[PDB]
Design a protein around this ligand. Structure first.
Ligand SMILES: N[C@@H](CCC(=O)N[C@@H](CS)C(=O)NCC(=O)O)C(=O)O
Ligand SMILES: N[C@@H](CCC(=O)N[C@@H](CS)C(=O)NCC(=O)O)C(=O)O
Lengths: 213, 213
Protein backbone atom coordinates (compact mmCIF):
# COMPACT_ATOMS: atom_id res chain seq x y z
CA UNK A 1 0.00 0.00 0.00
CA UNK A 2 0.94 3.75 0.34
CA UNK A 3 1.15 5.59 3.70
CA UNK A 4 -0.61 8.97 4.38
CA UNK A 5 0.56 10.73 7.61
CA UNK A 6 -1.95 12.83 9.57
CA UNK A 7 -5.31 12.66 11.39
CA UNK A 8 -8.27 11.69 9.09
CA UNK A 9 -10.26 14.52 10.91
CA UNK A 10 -7.73 16.90 9.15
CA UNK A 11 -9.06 18.67 5.96
CA UNK A 12 -5.70 18.71 4.04
CA UNK A 13 -5.61 14.90 4.80
CA UNK A 14 -9.21 14.30 3.60
CA UNK A 15 -8.00 16.06 0.35
CA UNK A 16 -5.43 13.19 -0.22
CA UNK A 17 -7.68 10.51 1.41
CA UNK A 18 -10.49 11.22 -1.17
CA UNK A 19 -8.16 11.24 -4.25
CA UNK A 20 -7.16 7.62 -3.27
CA UNK A 21 -10.77 6.47 -2.62
CA UNK A 22 -11.76 7.91 -6.09
CA UNK A 23 -8.93 6.02 -7.81
CA UNK A 24 -9.54 2.73 -5.83
CA UNK A 25 -5.85 2.52 -4.64
CA UNK A 26 -4.93 0.47 -1.46
CA UNK A 27 -3.70 2.75 1.44
CA UNK A 28 -3.09 3.10 5.24
CA UNK A 29 -3.56 6.37 7.27
CA UNK A 30 -0.76 6.49 9.92
CA UNK A 31 -2.05 9.14 12.49
CA UNK A 32 0.09 12.00 13.95
CA UNK A 33 -0.67 13.53 17.42
CA UNK A 34 -0.61 17.40 17.58
CA UNK A 35 -0.93 17.35 21.43
CA UNK A 36 2.45 15.48 21.58
CA UNK A 37 4.03 17.74 18.88
CA UNK A 38 4.60 14.56 16.79
CA UNK A 39 4.60 16.71 13.61
CA UNK A 40 7.70 18.63 14.88
CA UNK A 41 9.39 15.30 15.93
CA UNK A 42 12.46 14.16 13.94
CA UNK A 43 10.71 11.09 12.34
CA UNK A 44 8.15 13.48 10.73
CA UNK A 45 10.72 16.19 9.64
CA UNK A 46 12.29 13.30 7.57
CA UNK A 47 8.98 13.38 5.55
CA UNK A 48 8.05 17.14 5.75
CA UNK A 49 11.00 19.48 6.38
CA UNK A 50 8.40 22.13 7.59
CA UNK A 51 6.84 19.70 10.09
CA UNK A 52 3.23 20.07 8.94
CA UNK A 53 0.66 17.33 8.09
CA UNK A 54 0.08 15.73 5.73
CA UNK A 55 3.02 13.79 4.24
CA UNK A 56 3.09 10.70 1.96
CA UNK A 57 5.20 7.55 1.40
CA UNK A 58 5.12 5.40 -1.76
CA UNK A 59 7.95 2.98 -0.81
CA UNK A 60 11.14 5.16 -0.95
CA UNK A 61 9.23 8.26 -2.23
CA UNK A 62 8.46 10.95 0.40
CA UNK A 63 6.05 13.72 -0.53
CA UNK A 64 4.44 16.69 1.32
CA UNK A 65 1.81 19.33 0.36
CA UNK A 66 -1.75 17.86 -0.06
CA UNK A 67 -2.22 19.19 -3.67
CA UNK A 68 1.18 17.90 -4.97
CA UNK A 69 0.46 14.51 -3.22
CA UNK A 70 -3.01 14.45 -4.94
CA UNK A 71 -1.70 15.21 -8.47
CA UNK A 72 0.96 12.45 -7.98
CA UNK A 73 -1.75 9.94 -6.82
CA UNK A 74 -4.13 10.86 -9.70
CA UNK A 75 -1.39 10.74 -12.45
CA UNK A 76 0.00 7.39 -11.04
CA UNK A 77 -3.34 5.44 -10.69
CA UNK A 78 -4.87 6.90 -13.95
CA UNK A 79 -7.43 4.40 -15.40
CA UNK A 80 -9.22 5.30 -18.70
CA UNK A 81 -12.53 5.23 -16.66
CA UNK A 82 -10.92 7.78 -14.12
CA UNK A 83 -8.74 10.70 -15.53
CA UNK A 84 -9.62 13.45 -12.95
CA UNK A 85 -6.77 15.76 -14.25
CA UNK A 86 -7.57 15.47 -18.05
CA UNK A 87 -3.88 15.64 -19.18
CA UNK A 88 -4.84 14.11 -22.62
CA UNK A 89 -6.95 17.28 -23.51
CA UNK A 90 -4.71 20.40 -22.91
CA UNK A 91 -7.73 22.81 -22.65
CA UNK A 92 -9.82 20.62 -20.28
CA UNK A 93 -6.51 20.46 -18.28
CA UNK A 94 -6.18 24.31 -18.00
CA UNK A 95 -9.81 24.51 -16.68
CA UNK A 96 -8.96 22.02 -13.84
CA UNK A 97 -5.76 24.05 -13.10
CA UNK A 98 -7.84 27.30 -12.96
CA UNK A 99 -10.53 26.08 -10.45
CA UNK A 100 -7.92 24.17 -8.42
CA UNK A 101 -6.27 27.60 -7.94
CA UNK A 102 -9.60 29.43 -7.28
CA UNK A 103 -9.99 27.11 -4.20
CA UNK A 104 -6.46 27.77 -2.90
CA UNK A 105 -6.38 31.56 -3.52
CA UNK A 106 -10.00 32.88 -3.47
CA UNK A 107 -12.59 30.43 -2.03
CA UNK A 108 -10.67 28.70 0.82
CA UNK A 109 -9.26 32.06 2.11
CA UNK A 110 -12.88 33.43 2.39
CA UNK A 111 -14.38 30.13 3.80
CA UNK A 112 -11.54 28.61 5.99
CA UNK A 113 -11.69 31.55 8.48
CA UNK A 114 -15.44 30.86 9.21
CA UNK A 115 -14.65 27.20 10.07
CA UNK A 116 -11.44 27.81 12.14
CA UNK A 117 -13.19 30.64 14.04
CA UNK A 118 -16.70 28.98 14.47
CA UNK A 119 -15.39 25.40 14.95
CA UNK A 120 -11.58 24.80 15.45
CA UNK A 121 -11.46 27.68 18.01
CA UNK A 122 -14.28 26.47 20.36
CA UNK A 123 -14.16 22.66 19.62
CA UNK A 124 -10.30 22.26 19.58
CA UNK A 125 -7.91 24.71 21.33
CA UNK A 126 -10.83 26.38 23.24
CA UNK A 127 -10.48 30.20 22.53
CA UNK A 128 -13.63 32.26 21.55
CA UNK A 129 -14.86 33.23 17.96
CA UNK A 130 -14.33 36.78 16.50
CA UNK A 131 -17.61 38.41 15.23
CA UNK A 132 -15.37 40.98 13.36
CA UNK A 133 -13.65 38.08 11.38
CA UNK A 134 -16.65 35.76 10.77
CA UNK A 135 -18.87 38.71 9.62
CA UNK A 136 -16.21 40.01 7.14
CA UNK A 137 -15.39 36.50 5.75
CA UNK A 138 -19.16 35.93 5.01
CA UNK A 139 -19.57 39.10 2.83
CA UNK A 140 -16.24 38.10 1.17
CA UNK A 141 -17.70 34.57 0.56
CA UNK A 142 -21.18 35.78 -0.65
CA UNK A 143 -19.57 37.68 -3.58
CA UNK A 144 -17.34 34.59 -4.36
CA UNK A 145 -20.40 32.22 -4.51
CA UNK A 146 -21.99 34.73 -6.99
CA UNK A 147 -19.29 33.55 -9.47
CA UNK A 148 -19.78 29.85 -8.52
CA UNK A 149 -23.64 30.12 -9.18
CA UNK A 150 -22.90 31.68 -12.62
CA UNK A 151 -20.34 28.96 -13.51
CA UNK A 152 -22.48 26.08 -12.11
CA UNK A 153 -25.57 27.29 -14.08
CA UNK A 154 -23.54 26.80 -17.38
CA UNK A 155 -21.65 23.57 -16.32
CA UNK A 156 -22.44 20.66 -13.93
CA UNK A 157 -18.84 20.89 -12.56
CA UNK A 158 -16.36 23.83 -12.29
CA UNK A 159 -14.07 22.33 -14.99
CA UNK A 160 -16.66 21.35 -17.62
CA UNK A 161 -19.39 18.64 -17.75
CA UNK A 162 -17.23 16.13 -15.75
CA UNK A 163 -15.95 15.52 -12.18
CA UNK A 164 -12.31 16.72 -11.83
CA UNK A 165 -9.67 17.39 -9.12
CA UNK A 166 -11.07 21.03 -9.14
CA UNK A 167 -14.43 19.73 -7.85
CA UNK A 168 -12.70 17.44 -5.19
CA UNK A 169 -10.37 20.22 -3.81
CA UNK A 170 -13.56 22.12 -2.70
CA UNK A 171 -14.83 19.12 -0.64
CA UNK A 172 -12.91 18.99 2.69
CA UNK A 173 -13.24 22.65 3.95
CA UNK A 174 -16.80 22.97 2.54
CA UNK A 175 -17.80 19.79 4.46
CA UNK A 176 -16.88 21.51 7.81
CA UNK A 177 -18.63 24.78 6.74
CA UNK A 178 -21.75 22.53 6.48
CA UNK A 179 -21.60 22.02 10.37
CA UNK A 180 -21.42 25.80 11.28
CA UNK A 181 -24.68 27.77 11.91
CA UNK A 182 -24.08 29.49 8.49
CA UNK A 183 -24.49 26.25 6.40
CA UNK A 184 -27.98 27.52 5.21
CA UNK A 185 -26.02 30.23 3.23
CA UNK A 186 -25.74 27.67 0.33
CA UNK A 187 -29.61 27.45 0.18
CA UNK A 188 -29.52 31.03 -1.35
CA UNK A 189 -27.22 29.65 -4.18
CA UNK A 190 -29.27 26.80 -5.70
CA UNK A 191 -26.90 25.67 -8.56
CA UNK A 192 -24.01 25.47 -5.99
CA UNK A 193 -26.26 23.63 -3.51
CA UNK A 194 -27.10 21.34 -6.55
CA UNK A 195 -23.36 20.74 -7.30
CA UNK A 196 -22.73 20.17 -3.55
CA UNK A 197 -25.42 17.41 -3.29
CA UNK A 198 -24.06 15.83 -6.55
CA UNK A 199 -20.61 15.54 -4.81
CA UNK A 200 -22.03 14.53 -1.38
CA UNK A 201 -23.73 11.49 -3.09
CA UNK A 202 -20.60 9.92 -4.74
CA UNK A 203 -19.51 6.60 -3.13
CA UNK A 204 -15.87 7.78 -2.45
CA UNK A 205 -17.03 11.12 -0.83
CA UNK A 206 -19.70 9.08 1.12
CA UNK A 207 -16.77 6.97 2.60
CA UNK A 208 -14.29 9.85 3.45
CA UNK A 209 -17.10 11.90 5.11
CA UNK A 210 -17.23 8.90 7.56
CA UNK A 211 -13.54 9.72 8.42
CA UNK A 212 -14.39 13.31 9.56
CA UNK A 213 -16.09 12.70 12.99
CA UNK B 1 0.50 35.53 -30.66
CA UNK B 2 -1.12 35.10 -27.15
CA UNK B 3 -2.31 38.04 -24.99
CA UNK B 4 -1.33 38.47 -21.28
CA UNK B 5 -3.41 41.13 -19.40
CA UNK B 6 -1.74 43.14 -16.61
CA UNK B 7 1.17 45.51 -15.89
CA UNK B 8 4.65 43.93 -16.52
CA UNK B 9 5.72 45.60 -13.15
CA UNK B 10 3.22 43.07 -11.56
CA UNK B 11 4.83 39.92 -9.97
CA UNK B 12 1.97 37.47 -10.84
CA UNK B 13 2.39 38.80 -14.46
CA UNK B 14 6.21 38.35 -14.48
CA UNK B 15 5.37 34.70 -13.41
CA UNK B 16 3.50 34.16 -16.79
CA UNK B 17 5.81 36.55 -18.74
CA UNK B 18 8.91 34.42 -17.81
CA UNK B 19 7.28 31.02 -18.63
CA UNK B 20 6.74 32.37 -22.23
CA UNK B 21 10.29 33.81 -22.55
CA UNK B 22 11.69 30.38 -21.37
CA UNK B 23 9.62 28.52 -23.99
CA UNK B 24 10.39 31.07 -26.82
CA UNK B 25 6.63 31.62 -27.62
CA UNK B 26 5.47 34.88 -29.40
CA UNK B 27 3.30 37.13 -27.07
CA UNK B 28 1.90 40.67 -26.38
CA UNK B 29 1.38 42.19 -22.86
CA UNK B 30 -1.86 44.27 -22.97
CA UNK B 31 -1.59 46.57 -19.83
CA UNK B 32 -4.43 47.17 -17.29
CA UNK B 33 -4.65 50.43 -15.22
CA UNK B 34 -5.41 49.96 -11.45
CA UNK B 35 -5.86 53.77 -10.96
CA UNK B 36 -8.83 53.63 -13.44
CA UNK B 37 -10.20 50.37 -11.88
CA UNK B 38 -9.79 48.75 -15.35
CA UNK B 39 -9.53 45.31 -13.64
CA UNK B 40 -13.11 45.71 -12.24
CA UNK B 41 -14.37 46.97 -15.68
CA UNK B 42 -16.73 44.69 -17.65
CA UNK B 43 -14.20 43.92 -20.48
CA UNK B 44 -11.83 42.41 -17.85
CA UNK B 45 -14.55 40.49 -15.87
CA UNK B 46 -15.16 38.66 -19.24
CA UNK B 47 -11.58 37.26 -18.75
CA UNK B 48 -11.36 37.02 -14.89
CA UNK B 49 -14.74 36.74 -13.12
CA UNK B 50 -12.93 37.95 -9.88
CA UNK B 51 -11.50 41.03 -11.62
CA UNK B 52 -7.86 40.48 -10.69
CA UNK B 53 -4.74 40.53 -12.95
CA UNK B 54 -3.43 38.59 -14.68
CA UNK B 55 -5.63 36.95 -17.33
CA UNK B 56 -4.72 35.21 -20.63
CA UNK B 57 -6.11 34.80 -24.18
CA UNK B 58 -5.02 32.08 -26.65
CA UNK B 59 -7.53 32.90 -29.44
CA UNK B 60 -10.95 31.87 -27.98
CA UNK B 61 -9.38 30.46 -24.74
CA UNK B 62 -9.63 32.72 -21.64
CA UNK B 63 -7.60 31.80 -18.58
CA UNK B 64 -6.93 33.40 -15.15
CA UNK B 65 -4.65 32.50 -12.18
CA UNK B 66 -0.88 32.94 -12.96
CA UNK B 67 0.07 29.30 -12.01
CA UNK B 68 -2.73 27.65 -14.10
CA UNK B 69 -1.80 30.01 -17.04
CA UNK B 70 1.90 28.96 -16.62
CA UNK B 71 1.21 25.17 -16.57
CA UNK B 72 -0.98 25.63 -19.73
CA UNK B 73 1.83 27.62 -21.49
CA UNK B 74 4.54 25.08 -20.47
CA UNK B 75 2.47 21.96 -21.47
CA UNK B 76 1.42 23.62 -24.84
CA UNK B 77 4.91 24.85 -26.03
CA UNK B 78 6.78 21.71 -24.71
CA UNK B 79 9.97 21.14 -26.80
CA UNK B 80 12.21 18.09 -25.97
CA UNK B 81 15.00 20.66 -25.14
CA UNK B 82 12.50 22.45 -22.66
CA UNK B 83 10.18 20.24 -20.43
CA UNK B 84 10.03 22.46 -17.27
CA UNK B 85 7.15 20.34 -15.75
CA UNK B 86 8.72 16.83 -16.34
CA UNK B 87 5.37 15.06 -17.05
CA UNK B 88 7.23 12.13 -18.77
CA UNK B 89 8.90 11.13 -15.38
CA UNK B 90 6.08 10.82 -12.71
CA UNK B 91 8.53 11.21 -9.74
CA UNK B 92 10.45 14.23 -11.16
CA UNK B 93 6.89 15.63 -11.73
CA UNK B 94 5.85 15.23 -8.01
CA UNK B 95 9.06 17.12 -6.94
CA UNK B 96 8.10 20.12 -9.18
CA UNK B 97 4.52 19.97 -7.74
CA UNK B 98 5.94 19.95 -4.16
CA UNK B 99 8.24 23.04 -4.49
CA UNK B 100 5.65 24.87 -6.62
CA UNK B 101 3.38 24.51 -3.56
CA UNK B 102 6.14 25.44 -1.03
CA UNK B 103 6.30 28.86 -2.84
CA UNK B 104 2.52 29.41 -2.74
CA UNK B 105 1.92 28.20 0.86
CA UNK B 106 5.17 28.66 2.88
CA UNK B 107 7.81 30.90 1.18
CA UNK B 108 5.68 33.61 -0.53
CA UNK B 109 3.49 34.09 2.62
CA UNK B 110 6.69 34.76 4.70
CA UNK B 111 8.42 36.92 1.96
CA UNK B 112 5.51 38.80 0.19
CA UNK B 113 4.66 40.78 3.39
CA UNK B 114 8.24 42.25 3.55
CA UNK B 115 7.94 43.53 -0.06
CA UNK B 116 4.33 44.89 0.15
CA UNK B 117 5.15 46.58 3.49
CA UNK B 118 8.74 47.88 2.63
CA UNK B 119 8.00 48.68 -1.06
CA UNK B 120 4.32 48.61 -2.33
CA UNK B 121 3.20 50.62 0.76
CA UNK B 122 5.66 53.58 0.44
CA UNK B 123 6.34 53.45 -3.39
CA UNK B 124 2.70 52.81 -4.55
CA UNK B 125 -0.37 53.71 -2.43
CA UNK B 126 1.77 55.80 0.01
CA UNK B 127 0.92 54.45 3.57
CA UNK B 128 3.80 53.71 6.08
CA UNK B 129 5.53 50.28 6.82
CA UNK B 130 4.70 48.20 9.99
CA UNK B 131 7.84 47.27 12.07
CA UNK B 132 5.60 44.66 13.90
CA UNK B 133 4.84 42.90 10.49
CA UNK B 134 8.26 43.20 8.76
CA UNK B 135 10.11 41.99 11.92
CA UNK B 136 7.83 38.91 12.34
CA UNK B 137 7.91 37.98 8.60
CA UNK B 138 11.80 38.00 8.70
CA UNK B 139 12.08 35.45 11.60
CA UNK B 140 9.37 33.42 9.76
CA UNK B 141 11.50 33.64 6.54
CA UNK B 142 14.89 32.87 8.27
CA UNK B 143 13.60 29.44 9.43
CA UNK B 144 12.13 28.79 5.89
CA UNK B 145 15.52 29.54 4.17
CA UNK B 146 17.12 27.01 6.62
CA UNK B 147 15.21 24.32 4.63
CA UNK B 148 16.13 25.91 1.25
CA UNK B 149 19.95 25.89 2.19
CA UNK B 150 19.65 22.18 3.14
CA UNK B 151 17.82 21.30 -0.12
CA UNK B 152 20.10 23.49 -2.32
CA UNK B 153 23.27 21.92 -0.78
CA UNK B 154 22.04 18.43 -2.07
CA UNK B 155 20.57 19.65 -5.45
CA UNK B 156 21.36 22.57 -7.82
CA UNK B 157 17.58 23.25 -8.14
CA UNK B 158 14.62 22.62 -5.75
CA UNK B 159 13.21 19.83 -8.00
CA UNK B 160 16.40 17.88 -8.76
CA UNK B 161 19.52 18.66 -10.87
CA UNK B 162 17.48 20.62 -13.49
CA UNK B 163 15.63 23.97 -13.89
CA UNK B 164 11.85 23.49 -13.41
CA UNK B 165 8.64 25.57 -12.95
CA UNK B 166 9.37 25.21 -9.14
CA UNK B 167 12.58 27.26 -9.57
CA UNK B 168 10.77 29.90 -11.81
CA UNK B 169 7.78 30.41 -9.41
CA UNK B 170 10.31 31.73 -6.79
CA UNK B 171 11.63 34.43 -9.20
CA UNK B 172 9.14 37.36 -9.29
CA UNK B 173 8.58 38.05 -5.51
CA UNK B 174 12.24 37.24 -4.67
CA UNK B 175 13.38 39.79 -7.33
CA UNK B 176 11.52 42.61 -5.42
CA UNK B 177 12.86 41.35 -2.03
CA UNK B 178 16.31 42.00 -3.62
CA UNK B 179 15.47 45.84 -3.67
CA UNK B 180 14.47 46.09 0.08
CA UNK B 181 17.15 46.95 2.72
CA UNK B 182 16.96 43.25 3.85
CA UNK B 183 18.33 41.81 0.53
CA UNK B 184 21.71 41.04 2.31
CA UNK B 185 19.75 38.36 4.31
CA UNK B 186 20.49 35.90 1.40
CA UNK B 187 24.29 36.45 1.94
CA UNK B 188 23.90 34.38 5.22
CA UNK B 189 22.48 31.45 3.07
CA UNK B 190 25.25 30.77 0.52
CA UNK B 191 23.73 27.77 -1.41
CA UNK B 192 20.46 29.79 -1.85
CA UNK B 193 22.46 32.89 -2.89
CA UNK B 194 24.26 30.44 -5.32
CA UNK B 195 20.91 29.16 -6.75
CA UNK B 196 19.65 32.79 -6.96
CA UNK B 197 22.68 33.95 -9.07
CA UNK B 198 22.29 30.79 -11.29
CA UNK B 199 18.66 31.94 -12.04
CA UNK B 200 19.52 35.68 -12.31
CA UNK B 201 22.03 34.79 -15.14
CA UNK B 202 19.60 32.90 -17.50
CA UNK B 203 18.80 34.80 -20.75
CA UNK B 204 14.96 34.65 -20.23
CA UNK B 205 15.18 35.89 -16.55
CA UNK B 206 17.71 38.57 -17.77
CA UNK B 207 14.96 39.84 -20.22
CA UNK B 208 11.90 39.78 -17.81
CA UNK B 209 13.92 41.55 -15.06
CA UNK B 210 14.08 44.43 -17.64
CA UNK B 211 10.21 44.50 -17.47
CA UNK B 212 10.19 45.19 -13.68
CA UNK B 213 11.25 48.91 -13.51
N1 LIG C 1 -1.10 23.90 2.80
C1 LIG C 1 -0.24 22.71 3.04
C2 LIG C 1 -0.08 22.42 4.55
C3 LIG C 1 -1.36 22.40 5.40
C4 LIG C 1 -1.04 22.60 6.87
O1 LIG C 1 -0.25 23.47 7.23
N2 LIG C 1 -1.58 21.74 7.74
C5 LIG C 1 -1.80 22.02 9.15
C6 LIG C 1 -2.90 21.14 9.71
S1 LIG C 1 -3.73 21.81 11.18
C7 LIG C 1 -0.57 21.91 10.09
O2 LIG C 1 0.22 20.98 9.99
N3 LIG C 1 -0.46 22.85 11.03
C8 LIG C 1 0.58 22.81 12.04
C9 LIG C 1 1.85 23.55 11.62
O3 LIG C 1 1.91 23.93 10.43
O4 LIG C 1 2.72 23.73 12.50
C10 LIG C 1 -0.77 21.54 2.19
O5 LIG C 1 -0.93 21.75 0.95
O6 LIG C 1 -0.98 20.46 2.77
N1 LIG D 1 -3.11 34.65 -6.86
C1 LIG D 1 -3.79 34.93 -8.16
C2 LIG D 1 -4.19 36.41 -8.28
C3 LIG D 1 -3.13 37.46 -7.94
C4 LIG D 1 -3.76 38.80 -7.63
O1 LIG D 1 -4.74 38.88 -6.90
N2 LIG D 1 -3.26 39.87 -8.25
C5 LIG D 1 -3.38 41.24 -7.77
C6 LIG D 1 -2.28 42.12 -8.33
S1 LIG D 1 -1.89 43.58 -7.33
C7 LIG D 1 -4.73 41.96 -8.00
O2 LIG D 1 -5.32 41.88 -9.08
N3 LIG D 1 -5.19 42.70 -6.99
C8 LIG D 1 -6.38 43.51 -7.11
C9 LIG D 1 -7.65 42.77 -6.70
O3 LIG D 1 -7.55 41.55 -6.49
O4 LIG D 1 -8.71 43.45 -6.59
C10 LIG D 1 -2.91 34.38 -9.30
O5 LIG D 1 -2.54 33.16 -9.21
O6 LIG D 1 -2.63 35.15 -10.23
Amino acid sequence: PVKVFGPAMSTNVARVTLCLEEVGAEYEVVNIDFNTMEHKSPEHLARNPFGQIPAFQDGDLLLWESRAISKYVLRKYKTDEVDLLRESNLEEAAMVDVWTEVDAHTYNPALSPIVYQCLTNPMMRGLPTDEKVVAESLEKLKKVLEVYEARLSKHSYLAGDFVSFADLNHFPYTFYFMATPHAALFDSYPHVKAWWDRLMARPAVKKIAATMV
